[PDB]
Amino acid sequence: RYSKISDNYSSLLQVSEALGRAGLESSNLIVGIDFTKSNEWTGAKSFNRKSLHHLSNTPNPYEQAITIIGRTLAAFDEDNLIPCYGFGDASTHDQDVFSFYPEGRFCNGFEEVLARYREIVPQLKLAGPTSFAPIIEMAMTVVEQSSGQYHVLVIIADGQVTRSVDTEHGRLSPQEQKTVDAIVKASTLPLSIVLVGVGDGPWDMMQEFADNIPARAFDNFQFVNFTEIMSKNKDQSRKETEFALSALMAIPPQYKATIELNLLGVRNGNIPQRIPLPPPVQ
Ligand SMILES: [Mg+2]
Ligand code: NA
Numbered sequence: 001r002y003s004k005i006s007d008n009y010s011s012l013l014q015v016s017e018a019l020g021r022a023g024l025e026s027s028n029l030i031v032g033i034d035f036t037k038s039n040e041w042t043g044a045k046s047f048n049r050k051s052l053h054h055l056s057n058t059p060n061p062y063e064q065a066i067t068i069i070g071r072t073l074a075a076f077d078e079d080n081l082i083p084c085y086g087f088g089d090a091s092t093h094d095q096d097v098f099s100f101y102p103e104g105r106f107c108n109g110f111e112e113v114l115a116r117y118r119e120i121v122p123q124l125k126l127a128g129p130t131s132f133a134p135i136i137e138m139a140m141t142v143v144e145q146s147s148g149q150y151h152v153l154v155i156i157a158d159g160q161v162t163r164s165v166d167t168e169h170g171r172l173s174p175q176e177q178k179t180v181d182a183i184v185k186a187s188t189l190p191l192s193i194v195l196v197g198v199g200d201g202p203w204d205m206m207q208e209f210a211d212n213i214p215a216r217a218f219d220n221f222q223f224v225n226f227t228e229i230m231s232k233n234k235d236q237s238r239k240e241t242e243f244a245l246s247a248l249m250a251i252p253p254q255y256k257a258t259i260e261l262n263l264l265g266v267r268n269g270n271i272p273q274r275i276p277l278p279p280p281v282q
Pocket of ligand 2: 027028029077078079080081082
């Protein structure tokens with residue numbers, strides 16, 4: 001389906017204009033970046049045996065995904081600010097996020113997200129394990145503090161939520177429990193969540209995990225496999241629009257749902273205030 005749609009989109013500008021015609025209006029963007037140690041080896045097949053966070057003259061998958069998403073959504077972001085957080089490094093493990101800048105100051109445009117990402121990366125100690133509860137909870141706080149303005153949270157990660165050793169017997173890990181609880185609680189706010197998978201994964205159990213999230217007032221969550229889309233045999237500019245559309249085409253209907261449910265522009269009043277850690281850098 002997304003392939004069939006993207007065949008007719010030759011540029012990200014075309015995608016942006018389509019999002020607008022589909023009803024997307026003022027829209028804010030939050031970015032969360034996975035700094036787990038697994039990034040060192042999840043590029044075995046997908047990134048020529050280099051770390052997914054490897055910095056060079058060519059953009060790694062994080063930089064690629066940020067660029068495509070940022071360029072597609074830039075026109076809708078009236079103040080051009082992008083709250084950006086890391087998680088999964090040694091300073092946060094699966095418990096916290098850190099802000100890209102001290103005092104939680106937001107990036108000014110996706111270009112600054114990219115620049116600051118490159119500044120931060122070599123200074124980090126990569127760790128784990130993997131939970132998306134802290135980053136989703138951070139996004140909830142930002143939405144609440146904005147007085148209910150519509151946000152899209154884009155999480156870019158190289159693995160599924162950490163599973164229980166006893167997953168085969170139907171048991172959930174604390175990471176899974178908290179992450180699912182956060183996705184559900186997030187649906188009480190005007191917030192859309194996009195989990196972008198980069199690297200080798202594996203990702204086969206992710207879309208099953210997504211399918212089994214408890215029923216919510218609106219479908220506020222999607223998984224998109226960047227690796228799989230980019231590994232396809234077609235034009236790069238077409239793979240890029242297919243990724244953009246796969247990630248974002250569901251955003252305008254979700255936005256419309258936040259209006260229908262009257263979530264837009266109001267405070268929920270029951271959102272714990274998560275505090276981001278400072279960036280663990282010089
Ligand atoms: Mg990982
Ligand atoms: Na904004």
